[PDB]
Design a protein around this nucleic acid. Sequence first.
DNA 1: GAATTCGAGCTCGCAACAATGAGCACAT
DNA 2: ACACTGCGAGCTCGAATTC
Lengths: 280, 320, 675
Amino acid sequence: LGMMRHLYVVVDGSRTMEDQDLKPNRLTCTLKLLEYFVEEYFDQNPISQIGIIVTKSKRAEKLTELSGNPRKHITSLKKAVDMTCHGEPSLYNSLSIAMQTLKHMPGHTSREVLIIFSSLTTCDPSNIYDLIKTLKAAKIRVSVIGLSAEVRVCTVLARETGGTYHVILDESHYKELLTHHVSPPPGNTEPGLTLGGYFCPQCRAKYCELPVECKICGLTLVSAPHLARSYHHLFPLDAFQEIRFCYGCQGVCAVCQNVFCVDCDVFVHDSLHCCPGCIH
Amino acid sequence: FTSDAKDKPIGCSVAISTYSMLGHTTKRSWEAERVMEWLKTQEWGLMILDEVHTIPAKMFRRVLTIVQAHCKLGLTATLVREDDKIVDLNFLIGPKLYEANWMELQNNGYIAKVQCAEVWCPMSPEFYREYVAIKTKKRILLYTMNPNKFRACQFLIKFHERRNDKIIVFADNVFALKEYAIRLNKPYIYGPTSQGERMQILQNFKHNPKINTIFISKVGDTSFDLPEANVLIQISSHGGSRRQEAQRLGRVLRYNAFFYSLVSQDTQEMAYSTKRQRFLVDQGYSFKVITKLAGMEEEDLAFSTKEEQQQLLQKVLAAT
Amino acid sequence: MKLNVDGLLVYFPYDYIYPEQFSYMRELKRTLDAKGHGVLEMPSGTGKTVSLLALIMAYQRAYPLEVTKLIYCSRTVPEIEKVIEELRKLLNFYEKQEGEKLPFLGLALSSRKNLCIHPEVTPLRFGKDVDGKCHSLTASYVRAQYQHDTSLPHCRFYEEFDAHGREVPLPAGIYNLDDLKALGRRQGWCPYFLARYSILHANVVVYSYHYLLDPKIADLVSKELARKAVVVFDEAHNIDNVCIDSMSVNLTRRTLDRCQGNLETLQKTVLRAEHFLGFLRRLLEYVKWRLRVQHVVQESPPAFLSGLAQRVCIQRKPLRFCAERLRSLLHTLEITDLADFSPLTLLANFATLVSTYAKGFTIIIEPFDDRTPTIANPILHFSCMDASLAIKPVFERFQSVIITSGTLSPLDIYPKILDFHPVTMATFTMTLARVCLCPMIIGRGNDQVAISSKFETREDIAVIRNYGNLLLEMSAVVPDGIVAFFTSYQYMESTVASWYEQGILENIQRNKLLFIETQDGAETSVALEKYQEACENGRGAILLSVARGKVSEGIDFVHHYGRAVIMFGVPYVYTQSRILKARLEYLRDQFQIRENDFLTFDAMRHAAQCVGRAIRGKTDYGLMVFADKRFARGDKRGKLPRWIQEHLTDANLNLTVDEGVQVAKYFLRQMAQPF
DNA sequence: GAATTCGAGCTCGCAACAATGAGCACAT
DNA sequence: ACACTGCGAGCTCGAATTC
Ligand code: SF4
Ligand SMILES: [Zn+2]
Ligand SMILES: [Zn+2]
Ligand SMILES: [Zn+2]
């Protein structure tokens, strides 16, 4: 159904992140919903990635490198609550850092940047309008979530590169905007299945209980039940025609010709996702 | 037609006026005299009588004979009213058309889910010494300026300022409005303040995340512009007005939001605060009882010692 | 789209019209059938232009004998070209809907420097220079030897025009200024004399104000054009300032010393008539004698003409034909250019204005230089007071004349100043899908200090800080462009250079760049092109300017340029100038206008013009603060018009500086979201 | 039945009001 | 031959209860 994704998350670190109108720290309410966002992203998208960049004082510093590590992100967002966040941000320096790595990904994916942006001013030493011709050439998809106002760049950066621009009503709207950024838009990788506890077959390296890639030999290690939930969307079961003694619960299929009741009929298509007669 | 604007009220299509302007039984001004001579001779259609429950008064029901209308719609929120004159309203206007199910609008999301809680406070042993000794209206101050009720107001304000909740402290008996709102350093719409600073204290409450509480006094008993409160610590209102505690509830639903009702127990306010829930339990609302709050003694609450409590009784009893 | 107003079939060039825009065509048809005037206030610039043109152009089809020609006086040449492009869009819609062609031509008129083909004369920059070098080739004595057709200088296009351009007119096809030059190019004709010839046979004619209200122009070009026409004065706020400056001349020491050189050159040419040079030498040494005094200011509008007959003995019967014979003397002298005699024509125009026009005029001789005790710089102003002395031809000659703008602030002032009686005098308000504007009056400061820009409340630093604390706290919550109109240039200098010595201008440059709009046009266009660049990339800018300036009237701030417009005080004129102190003494006796009700009327039409520049379009939104305490008064906020007054509530009426931010911060967040 | 407490709106007297800056389009 | 707009007095009600 969906495709692979390499999402970057640009987090604003300006003077305006000390603002109110949110949970105690405007910065803190951003990092609170981002930890919720990393969990739901990696759950619905199994083999994708997340980078997190934080822009501060006319410069961009990479908080976490681009890797599919659903633990290293949340353990780094907990550290960044005590950030200083002084100075005016940048947007040329942050989208270029998100372009030196995201350009060299293979073309079968959906490379994306997501900017969470509270300041109004991007003091950056060059012209932004040549990036939007470069990012459109490299098939990146930059989408901005704005705070408290609408900036002209963030409209023309979104609608030319291909993303969306959205401004916050409140915190119930800010969770609604981040929830819409987990569904993937409609190749052959080589991952290593990590049987035996959690060890790597290619380099035989033992490490932690994780769906993460292997550092010693560079292989990605996924768990096959986590891949298994994405099945049954492709070739799902066709419904039955319905016109006592049952076959499911023992108290009509067009394939195996075994009747069902009503509780069983709703249960087969909702949770079981297979016909109990057809497995025989 | 409210004596300040008068946007050429002769010859219009929609006139938005008040009661006690159309029924003002004294010598009117000259601008209002030429409008009332125009308004007494034109057959209207759909008079809209907002706040219907004040129409069966003696002066507000003479409006319906001054103005000639074909049909008369009446919009209200709290149809209950003392002195038994709501059955009298069935011929001034007509039959009651539609009453909204107050629990069906809560289960569908059109109204905030209110958690009513009648937290009652015990009486101080120095204040109950003088409560049972007198009967002639001086004990209304005693069950209002209770020091153990002062702690439960200061605790519930602190407990919801830490959750970023918009607090409204409705409090009648305006002597205890001052002595509550200056010992916590909070603004108060005293009622004879002005038209000026009434409008900016109310606006510093909505669009400012620093000013969080406000101490109204008998002003918000109508459909005013009180800006979407989240809690409502009602303290010592009028006697048995079940119209009032369905208009104090109107601020809250404009758990999600929840309003309290401070009662000094073992006094006359205990019998009053069950007369005023008599309308709200007939709509589906459930009034809990909070006998002891969630850790009231641990914070820095006022009136700790008995020396500072002896001075408050000498301030109350000196009024007489 | 067949749209039916009360009796007419209006062919509208769009699909959805606004519910107020139908009433604008309804109230304008109420003028034309009654054959009377009208003062209509209508907010937008476009939409108003296409609904006024949809009605009148469709009115002359059903009643082609009551109206014949629509005259459309716009402000200047950009809006002259804009109206014509709104007329092709209406004509080509009629070309598609009916499938035919029409005997319908529409023109556009401007100066000779906007309609010019001849290469040796077209790059001349100043407008008075191109009028001379054209006259050096098109004068009737230059063409006197061109009956021989020699190799002596001339205009190639002008001699090719009158031999072929009178027999055939322009057929159809609404012409811009560039279309008239292109038609003049490929045919070889002059564009300027083709437009002025074909202006008598047209149906829509779009020129500026000065062909119609300027008395020494309108008798030459708009004399015998139409007796049953329709005049529309579009964007007509400053009709009063146009009819005054058209009949007011200014004389100083620099002008009169150049007239002695003109009489010197006229003395060398007569020897190579003589009573007229001694006439002018008599008149020139009297006005120099009158400027020779160093005394109090004095006024004498017909008594100047009595003392002119005492020391000089020159009466008003030869003085009335002073400017006529000087126009005749240069014709018989066969001079090359006439821009060199521009001081002497200004003295000849001054001599024919004192003789004839003295009812509501004055002569204000000011030896006292402004703001300085004793500096030798005298000047006499011949100032007109009555703004209705230049429309008395226009209110009389034409059938119906409509005065339309967006910010006619009280509608009952314009028929009091201008002596006429309208038949509708209506106002309108634009419909909106949101609250497209959030006007507020940020009054007292953050520490409850008054903020107003009086004359005594300007030096103290309790107000200069409260202006700096406002522009700082609005530059952090407003995206992409803030326009800050000050009251003057010496108040913009004395505040910005007093924000810099404190720690306030350091903190504004962190948020937005700031681009001061200066007086000279070279730095201003640099600072304006970088302003529109800074609003488009990330940073955003602040264009802090002057309310009686060039940017306040010309440049239109469309969306995301100037989301906020900050008025740093009520933009009053200098209320102690001796010209204004004499006009208000004429507005008190005549018309019984109070002296204070005109200074506020003049200020609330320049504070509502530049604030109304922030919103032009459907989806345009825009903040507009009014940062003065005096705006909250009833005789000031009741002036500013009904489309920016119906959103100014009582809560946004004495907001402090910090409370005005949270109205703005909530407003821009609400507007940023889709429909 | 006749007060009170505290709110309301409507009239209407009362005291005193204010107003500081700078330049190009258009005719022979 | 002085004087605009806010702003507190009386005046008369209503709601619910004491007296
Ligand atoms: S006569 Fe024609 S070509 Fe010559 S200067 Fe005038 S407009 Fe230009
Ligand atoms: Zn490995
Ligand atoms: Zn089956
Ligand atoms: Zn079954």
